[PDB]
Coordinates of C-alpha atoms in Angstrom, one line a residue:
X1 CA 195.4 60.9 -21.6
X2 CA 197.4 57.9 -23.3
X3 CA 199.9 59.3 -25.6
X4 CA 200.9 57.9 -29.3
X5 CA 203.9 55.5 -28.8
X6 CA 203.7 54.2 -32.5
X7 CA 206.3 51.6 -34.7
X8 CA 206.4 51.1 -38.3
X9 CA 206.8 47.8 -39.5
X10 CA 208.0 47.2 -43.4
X11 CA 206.9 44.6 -45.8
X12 CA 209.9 43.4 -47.1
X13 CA 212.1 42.8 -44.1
X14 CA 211.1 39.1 -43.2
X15 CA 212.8 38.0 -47.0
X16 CA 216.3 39.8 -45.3
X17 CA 218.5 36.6 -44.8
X18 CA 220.2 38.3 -42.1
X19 CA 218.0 39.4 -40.3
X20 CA 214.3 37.9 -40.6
X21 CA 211.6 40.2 -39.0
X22 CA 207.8 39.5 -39.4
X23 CA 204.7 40.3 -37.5
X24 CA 205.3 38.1 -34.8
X25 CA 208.6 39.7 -33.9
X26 CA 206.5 43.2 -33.0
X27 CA 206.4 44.0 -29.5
X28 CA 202.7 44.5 -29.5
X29 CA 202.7 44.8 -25.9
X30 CA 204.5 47.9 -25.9
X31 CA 203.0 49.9 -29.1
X32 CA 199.6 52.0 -29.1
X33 CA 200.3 52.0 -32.7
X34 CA 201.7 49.5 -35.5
X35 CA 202.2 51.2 -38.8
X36 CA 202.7 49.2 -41.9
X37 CA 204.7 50.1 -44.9
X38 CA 203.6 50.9 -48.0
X39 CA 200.6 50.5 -49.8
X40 CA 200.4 52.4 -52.8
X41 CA 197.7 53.3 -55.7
X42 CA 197.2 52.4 -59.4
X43 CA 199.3 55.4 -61.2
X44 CA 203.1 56.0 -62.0
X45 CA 205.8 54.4 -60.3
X46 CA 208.6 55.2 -63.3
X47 CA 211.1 56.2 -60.5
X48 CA 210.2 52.4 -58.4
X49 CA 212.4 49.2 -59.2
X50 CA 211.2 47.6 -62.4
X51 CA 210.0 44.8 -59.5
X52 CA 207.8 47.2 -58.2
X53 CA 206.3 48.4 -61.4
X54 CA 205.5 45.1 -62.6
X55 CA 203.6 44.3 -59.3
X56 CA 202.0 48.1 -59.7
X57 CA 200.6 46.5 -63.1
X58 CA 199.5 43.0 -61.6
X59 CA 197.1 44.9 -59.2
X60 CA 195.5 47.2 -61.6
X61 CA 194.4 44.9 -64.1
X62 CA 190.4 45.6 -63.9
X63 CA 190.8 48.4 -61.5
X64 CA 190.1 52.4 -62.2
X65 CA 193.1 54.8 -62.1
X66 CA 193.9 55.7 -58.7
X67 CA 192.3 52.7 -56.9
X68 CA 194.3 52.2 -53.8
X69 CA 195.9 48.3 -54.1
X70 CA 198.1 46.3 -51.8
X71 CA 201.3 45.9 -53.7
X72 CA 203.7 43.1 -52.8
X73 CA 200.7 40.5 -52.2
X74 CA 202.8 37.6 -51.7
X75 CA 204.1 39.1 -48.7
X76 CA 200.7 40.8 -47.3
X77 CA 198.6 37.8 -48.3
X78 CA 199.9 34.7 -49.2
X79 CA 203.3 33.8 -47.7
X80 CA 202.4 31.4 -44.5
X81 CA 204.1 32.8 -42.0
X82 CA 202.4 30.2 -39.6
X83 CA 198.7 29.2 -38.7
X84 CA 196.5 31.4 -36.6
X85 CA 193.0 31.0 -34.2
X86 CA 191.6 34.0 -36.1
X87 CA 189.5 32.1 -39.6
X88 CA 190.3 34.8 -42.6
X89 CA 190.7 33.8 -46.4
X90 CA 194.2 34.9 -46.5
X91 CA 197.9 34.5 -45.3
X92 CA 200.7 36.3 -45.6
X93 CA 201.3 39.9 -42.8
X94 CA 197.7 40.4 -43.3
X95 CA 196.4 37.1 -40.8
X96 CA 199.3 37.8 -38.7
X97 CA 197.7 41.2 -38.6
X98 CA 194.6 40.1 -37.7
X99 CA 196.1 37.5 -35.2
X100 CA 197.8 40.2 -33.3
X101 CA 194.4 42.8 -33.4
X102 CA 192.9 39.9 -31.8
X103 CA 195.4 39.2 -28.9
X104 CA 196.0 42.7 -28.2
X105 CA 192.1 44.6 -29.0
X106 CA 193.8 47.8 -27.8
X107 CA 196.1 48.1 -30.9
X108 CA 196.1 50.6 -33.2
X109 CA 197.1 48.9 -36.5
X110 CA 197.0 51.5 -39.8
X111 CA 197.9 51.1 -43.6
X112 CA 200.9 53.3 -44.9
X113 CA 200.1 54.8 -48.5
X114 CA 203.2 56.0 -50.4
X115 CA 206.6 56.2 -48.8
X116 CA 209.9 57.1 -50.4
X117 CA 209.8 55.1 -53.1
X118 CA 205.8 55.1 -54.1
X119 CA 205.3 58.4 -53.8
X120 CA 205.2 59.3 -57.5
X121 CA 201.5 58.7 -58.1
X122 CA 199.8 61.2 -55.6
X123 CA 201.5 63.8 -58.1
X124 CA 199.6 62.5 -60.3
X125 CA 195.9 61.6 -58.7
X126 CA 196.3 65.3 -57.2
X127 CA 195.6 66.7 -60.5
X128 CA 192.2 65.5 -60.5
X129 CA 189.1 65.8 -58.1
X130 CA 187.5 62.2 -59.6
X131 CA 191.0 60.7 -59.1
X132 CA 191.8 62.1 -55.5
X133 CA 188.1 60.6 -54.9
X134 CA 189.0 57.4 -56.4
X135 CA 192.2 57.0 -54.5
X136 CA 189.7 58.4 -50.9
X137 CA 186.8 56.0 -51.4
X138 CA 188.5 52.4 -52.4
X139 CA 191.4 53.1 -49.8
X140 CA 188.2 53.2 -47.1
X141 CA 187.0 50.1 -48.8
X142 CA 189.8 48.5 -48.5
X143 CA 190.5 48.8 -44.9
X144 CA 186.8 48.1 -45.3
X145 CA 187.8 44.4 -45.8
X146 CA 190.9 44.1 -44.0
X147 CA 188.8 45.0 -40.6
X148 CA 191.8 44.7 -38.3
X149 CA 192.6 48.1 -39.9
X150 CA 191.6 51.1 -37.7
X151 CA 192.3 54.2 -40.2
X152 CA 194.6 55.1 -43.1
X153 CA 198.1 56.7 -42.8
X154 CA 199.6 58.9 -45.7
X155 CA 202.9 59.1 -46.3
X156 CA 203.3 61.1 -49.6
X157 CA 206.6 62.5 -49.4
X158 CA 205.7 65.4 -50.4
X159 CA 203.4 67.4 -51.7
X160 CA 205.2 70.6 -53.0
X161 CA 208.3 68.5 -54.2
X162 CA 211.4 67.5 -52.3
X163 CA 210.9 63.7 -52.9
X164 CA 212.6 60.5 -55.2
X165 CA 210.6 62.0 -59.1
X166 CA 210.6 65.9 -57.3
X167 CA 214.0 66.7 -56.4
X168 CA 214.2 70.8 -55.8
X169 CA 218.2 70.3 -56.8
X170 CA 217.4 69.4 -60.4
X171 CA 216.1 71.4 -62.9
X172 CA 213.6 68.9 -64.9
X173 CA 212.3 67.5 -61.9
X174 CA 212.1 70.7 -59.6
X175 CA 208.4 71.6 -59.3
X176 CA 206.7 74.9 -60.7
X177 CA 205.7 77.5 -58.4
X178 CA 201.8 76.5 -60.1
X179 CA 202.5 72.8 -59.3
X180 CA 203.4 73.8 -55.9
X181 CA 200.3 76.0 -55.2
X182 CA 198.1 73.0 -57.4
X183 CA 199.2 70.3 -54.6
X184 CA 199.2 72.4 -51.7
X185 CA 195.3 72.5 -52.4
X186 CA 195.2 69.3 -53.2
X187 CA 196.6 67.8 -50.2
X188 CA 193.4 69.7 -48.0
X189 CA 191.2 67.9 -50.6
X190 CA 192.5 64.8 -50.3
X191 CA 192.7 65.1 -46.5
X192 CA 189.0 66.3 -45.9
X193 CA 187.3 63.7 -48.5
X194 CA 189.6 60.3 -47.1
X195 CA 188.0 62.0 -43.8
X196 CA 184.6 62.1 -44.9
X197 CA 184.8 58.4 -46.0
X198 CA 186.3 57.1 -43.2
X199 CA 183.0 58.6 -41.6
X200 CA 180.4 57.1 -43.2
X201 CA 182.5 53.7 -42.8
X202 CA 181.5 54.8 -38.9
X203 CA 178.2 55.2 -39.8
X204 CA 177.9 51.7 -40.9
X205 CA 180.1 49.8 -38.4
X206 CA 180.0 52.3 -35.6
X207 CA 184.0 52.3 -34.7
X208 CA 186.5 55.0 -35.1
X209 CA 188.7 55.0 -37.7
X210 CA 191.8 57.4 -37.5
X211 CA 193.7 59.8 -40.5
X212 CA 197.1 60.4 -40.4
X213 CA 200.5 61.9 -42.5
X214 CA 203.8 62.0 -42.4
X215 CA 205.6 65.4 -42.3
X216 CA 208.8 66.1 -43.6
X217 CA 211.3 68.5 -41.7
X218 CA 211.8 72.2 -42.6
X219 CA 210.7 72.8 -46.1
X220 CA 209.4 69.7 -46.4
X221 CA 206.4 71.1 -44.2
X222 CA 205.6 74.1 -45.9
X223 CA 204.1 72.7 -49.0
X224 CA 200.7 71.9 -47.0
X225 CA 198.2 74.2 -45.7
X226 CA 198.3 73.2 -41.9
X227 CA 195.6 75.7 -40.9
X228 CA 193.1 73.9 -43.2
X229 CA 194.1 70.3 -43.0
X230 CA 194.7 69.5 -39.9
X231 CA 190.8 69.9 -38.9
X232 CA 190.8 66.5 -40.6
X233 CA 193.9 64.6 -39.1
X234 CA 194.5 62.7 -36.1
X235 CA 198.3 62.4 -36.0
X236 CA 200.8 64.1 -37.8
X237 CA 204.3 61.9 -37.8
X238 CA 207.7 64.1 -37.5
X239 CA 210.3 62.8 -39.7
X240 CA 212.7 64.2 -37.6
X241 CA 215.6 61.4 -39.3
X242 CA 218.0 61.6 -41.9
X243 CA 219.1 65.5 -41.4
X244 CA 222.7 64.5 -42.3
X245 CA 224.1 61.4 -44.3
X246 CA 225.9 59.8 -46.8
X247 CA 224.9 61.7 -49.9
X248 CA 227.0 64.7 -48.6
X249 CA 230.4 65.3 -46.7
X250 CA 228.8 67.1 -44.1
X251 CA 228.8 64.6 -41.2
X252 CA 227.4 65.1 -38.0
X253 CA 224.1 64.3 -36.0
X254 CA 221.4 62.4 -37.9
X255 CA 218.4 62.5 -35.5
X256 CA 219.4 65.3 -33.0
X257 CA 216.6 65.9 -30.3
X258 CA 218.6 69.5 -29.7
X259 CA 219.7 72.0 -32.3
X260 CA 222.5 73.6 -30.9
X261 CA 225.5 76.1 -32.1
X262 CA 227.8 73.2 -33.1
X263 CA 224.6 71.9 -35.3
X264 CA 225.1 71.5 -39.4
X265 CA 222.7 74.5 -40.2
X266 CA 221.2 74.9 -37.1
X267 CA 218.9 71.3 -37.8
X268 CA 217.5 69.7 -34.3
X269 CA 214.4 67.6 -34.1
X270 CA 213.3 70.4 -31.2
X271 CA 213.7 73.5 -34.3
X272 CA 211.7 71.5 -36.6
X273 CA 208.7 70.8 -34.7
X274 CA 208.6 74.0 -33.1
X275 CA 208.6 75.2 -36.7
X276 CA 205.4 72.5 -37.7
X277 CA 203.8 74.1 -34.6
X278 CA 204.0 77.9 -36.0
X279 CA 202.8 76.4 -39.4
X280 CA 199.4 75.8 -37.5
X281 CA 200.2 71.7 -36.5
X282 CA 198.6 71.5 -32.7
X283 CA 201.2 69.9 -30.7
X284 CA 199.3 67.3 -29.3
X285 CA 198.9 66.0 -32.9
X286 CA 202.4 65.7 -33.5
X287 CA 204.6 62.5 -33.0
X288 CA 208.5 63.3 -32.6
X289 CA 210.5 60.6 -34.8
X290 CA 213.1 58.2 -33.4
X291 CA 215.7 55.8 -35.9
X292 CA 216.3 52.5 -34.7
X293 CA 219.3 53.4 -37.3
X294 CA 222.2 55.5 -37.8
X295 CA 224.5 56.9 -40.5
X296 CA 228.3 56.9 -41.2
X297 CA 231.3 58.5 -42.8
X298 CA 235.0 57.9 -43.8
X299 CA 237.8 59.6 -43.6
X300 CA 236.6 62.5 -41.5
X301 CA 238.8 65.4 -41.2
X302 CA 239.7 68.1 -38.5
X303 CA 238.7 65.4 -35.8
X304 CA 240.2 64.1 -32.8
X305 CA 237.2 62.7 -31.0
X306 CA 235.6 65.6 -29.4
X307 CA 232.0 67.0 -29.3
X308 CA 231.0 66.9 -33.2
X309 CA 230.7 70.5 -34.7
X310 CA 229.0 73.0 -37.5
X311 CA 231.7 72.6 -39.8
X312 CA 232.6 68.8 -39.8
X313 CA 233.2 67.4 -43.1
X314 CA 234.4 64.0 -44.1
X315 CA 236.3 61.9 -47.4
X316 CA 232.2 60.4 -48.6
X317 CA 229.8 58.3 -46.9
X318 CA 231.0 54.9 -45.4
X319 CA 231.5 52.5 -48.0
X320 CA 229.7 49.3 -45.8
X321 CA 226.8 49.2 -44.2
X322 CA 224.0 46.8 -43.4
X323 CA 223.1 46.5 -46.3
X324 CA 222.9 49.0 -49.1
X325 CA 226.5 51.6 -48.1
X326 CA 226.2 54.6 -45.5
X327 CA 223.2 53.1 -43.1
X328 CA 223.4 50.5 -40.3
X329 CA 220.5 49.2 -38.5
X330 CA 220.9 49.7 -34.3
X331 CA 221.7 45.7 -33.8
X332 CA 224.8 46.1 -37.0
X333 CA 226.2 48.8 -34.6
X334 CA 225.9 47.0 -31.4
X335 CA 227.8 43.9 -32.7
X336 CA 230.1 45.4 -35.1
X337 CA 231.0 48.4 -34.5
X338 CA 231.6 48.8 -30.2
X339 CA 234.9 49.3 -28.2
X340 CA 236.2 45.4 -29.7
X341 CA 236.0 46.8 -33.1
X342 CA 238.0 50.3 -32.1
X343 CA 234.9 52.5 -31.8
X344 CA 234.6 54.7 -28.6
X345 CA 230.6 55.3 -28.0
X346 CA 230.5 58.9 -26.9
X347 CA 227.3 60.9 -26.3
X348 CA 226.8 64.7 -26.7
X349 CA 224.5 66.0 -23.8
X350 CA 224.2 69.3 -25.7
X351 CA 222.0 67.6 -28.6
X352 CA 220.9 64.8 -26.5
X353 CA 222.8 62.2 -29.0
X354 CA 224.9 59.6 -29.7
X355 CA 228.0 59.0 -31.9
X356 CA 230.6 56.6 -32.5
X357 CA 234.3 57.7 -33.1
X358 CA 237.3 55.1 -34.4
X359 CA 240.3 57.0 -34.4
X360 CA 242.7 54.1 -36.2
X361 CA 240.6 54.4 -38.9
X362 CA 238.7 58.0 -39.1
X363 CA 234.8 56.4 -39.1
X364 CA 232.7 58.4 -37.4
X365 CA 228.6 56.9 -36.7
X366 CA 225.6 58.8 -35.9
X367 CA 222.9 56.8 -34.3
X368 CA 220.2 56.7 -31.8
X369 CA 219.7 54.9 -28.5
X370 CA 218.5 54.0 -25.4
X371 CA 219.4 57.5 -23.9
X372 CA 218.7 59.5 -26.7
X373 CA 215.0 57.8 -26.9
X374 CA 214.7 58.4 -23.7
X375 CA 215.5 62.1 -23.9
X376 CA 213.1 62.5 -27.0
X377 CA 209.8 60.8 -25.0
X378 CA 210.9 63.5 -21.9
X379 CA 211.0 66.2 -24.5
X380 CA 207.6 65.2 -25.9
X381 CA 205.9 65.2 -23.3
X382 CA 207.0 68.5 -21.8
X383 CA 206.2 70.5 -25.1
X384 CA 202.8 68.9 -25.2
X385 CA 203.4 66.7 -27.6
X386 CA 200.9 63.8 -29.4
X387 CA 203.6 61.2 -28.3
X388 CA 206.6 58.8 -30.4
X389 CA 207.2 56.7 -33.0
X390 CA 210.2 54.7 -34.3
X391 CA 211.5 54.2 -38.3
X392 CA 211.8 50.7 -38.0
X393 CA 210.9 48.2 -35.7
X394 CA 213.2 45.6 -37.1
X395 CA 216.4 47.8 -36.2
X396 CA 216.3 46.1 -32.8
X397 CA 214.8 42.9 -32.8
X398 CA 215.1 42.7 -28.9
X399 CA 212.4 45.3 -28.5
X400 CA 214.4 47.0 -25.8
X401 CA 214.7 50.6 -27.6
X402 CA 210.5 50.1 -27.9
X403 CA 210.5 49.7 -24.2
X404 CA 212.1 52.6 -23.4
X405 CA 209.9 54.6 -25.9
X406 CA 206.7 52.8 -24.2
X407 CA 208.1 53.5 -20.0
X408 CA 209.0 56.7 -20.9
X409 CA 206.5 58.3 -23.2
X410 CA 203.6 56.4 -20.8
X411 CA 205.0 57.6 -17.3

């Protein structure tokens, strides 16, 4: 009766000069789960950075279409991020990996497949049975090697459309109503043969290896066939993020545990799941999302500091951020942008969420804390949920936020 309190953990962010994060930053203590992001597979990344590509190419060389490769390799295998007890023939994330499965043999540690970016190629491998069972039976053998590995995580984002190469708002990318149907069988394939490999991995080594997705909000859920793939599935990851931000006026919550009146279109975390729930996902599956982020406008109108509303609108997205514009990672907004800075922290009770509120210059920040983490591991435990996760661990390098999650989701 331990529930899911899970963090992800990207690839990239120890090369941020600001802010370094690596393995050994991970509250491992405090985490039933470490998820880390992305692996991919050999097919089309056109909408990827030409960086990307070219390490896309690098792997494949020799392999069959669809294998499922580590990308960036300098970062999972060779960078030395410091010497470890455990003996493996590698560096890079992958021996701190396996350092930190030894210290802490209770940990849950699982691969990431696709994500925003490198989700291109399932489009692809789904329109093949030999290629989905490509992609199923060398992703097995893969965490086959890398035995600090419990399972395989899929992030394909999404089957159905939606994503960076699908977009529903363009006409030459939008998907058919056939391609819709296509990957919405697809996806149970894929789901019951990764399971059937993971099984006969069992067979052999006689552990437990777990299969899990991401699942996009509203639509974003619809393109899968719940009733017939979650049989196969051992947590399905909320993305209950991003429901407002700097690609459209409309400002407002980002991460909202309650929907309420004064909600842009009615969106709240709680209205999503309950939604994933009547698509046939058993709620003790499920795994509400937290941000260890938020998002922020400028020049917001009709606004004097009050509780935010269902018609709030602002000039664009903030031009600054942490790094790229319109995003700011939880320890950016703690230093930068409090009371000193002319921002008044205000929480709405209502929606269970925090904002931030300059009136000099008209900036307003939607983010999530300590009290609105707290509110979300209540929540998911009294509608039966599978537990809590966090997009990304390296928002708060303290590992306070994660503590929270863990005292609350545990008690």
């Amino acid at each position: 009766e331990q529930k899911v309190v899970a963090g992800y953990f990207a690839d990239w962010q120890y090369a941020n000069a600001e802010n370094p994060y690596t393995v050994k930053d991970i509250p491992a203590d405090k985490l039933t789960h470490v998820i880390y992001a992305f692996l991919s597979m050999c097919g089309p990344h056109t909408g990827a950075s030409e960086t990307v590509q070219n390490l896309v190419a690098k792997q494949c060389e020799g392999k069959d279409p669809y294998t499922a490769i580590i990308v960036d390799t300098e970062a999972a295998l060779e960078k030395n991020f410091g010497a470890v007890s455990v003996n493996v023939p590698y560096k890079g994330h992958f021996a701190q990996l396996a350092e930190m499965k030894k210290q802490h043999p209770d940990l849950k540690i699982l691969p990431s497949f696709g994500g925003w970016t490198m989700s291109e190629p399932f489009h692809a491998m789904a329109k093949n049975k030999q290629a989905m069972d490509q992609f199923s039976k060398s992703a097995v053998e893969l965490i086959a090697q890398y035995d600090f590995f419990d399972g395989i995580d899929l992030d394909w984002e999404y089957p159905g459309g939606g994503g960076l190469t699908t977009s529903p708002w363009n006409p030459d990318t939008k998907l058919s109503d056939e391609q819709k149907a296509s990957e919405r069988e697809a996806f149970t394939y894929l789901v019951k043969t990764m399971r059937a490999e993971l099984d006969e991995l069992t067979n052999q080594t006689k552990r437990e290896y777990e299969l899990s997705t991401a699942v996009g909000v509203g639509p974003k859920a619809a393109g899968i066939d719940w009733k017939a793939a979650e049989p196969y599935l051992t947590n399905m990851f909320a993305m209950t993020y991003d429901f407002l931000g700097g690609w459209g006026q409309q400002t407002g919550h980002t991460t909202n545990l309650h929907a309420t009146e004064r909600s842009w279109w009615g969106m709240g975390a709680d209205v999503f799941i309950n939604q994933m729930i009547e698509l046939g996902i058993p709620s003790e599956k499920l795994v509400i999302g937290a941000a260890f982020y938020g998002r922020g406008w400028q020049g917001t109108k009709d606004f004097s500091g009050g509780l935010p509303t269902q018609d709030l609108v602002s000039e664009q997205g903030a031009q600054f951020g942490t790094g790229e514009n319109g995003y700011f990672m939880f320890w950016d907004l703690v230093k930068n942008y409090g009371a000193k800075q002319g921002y008044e922290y205000k929480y709405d009770e209502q929606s269970q969420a925090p904002y931030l509120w300059n009136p000099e210059k008209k900036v307003f920040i939607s983010y999530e804390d300590q009290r609105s983490i707290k509110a979300k591991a209540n929540w998911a435990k009294q509608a039966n949920l599978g537990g809590i996760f966090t997009w990304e661990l390296s928002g708060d390098p303290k590992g306070e936020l994660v503590e929270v999650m863990y005292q609350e989701m545990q008690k």
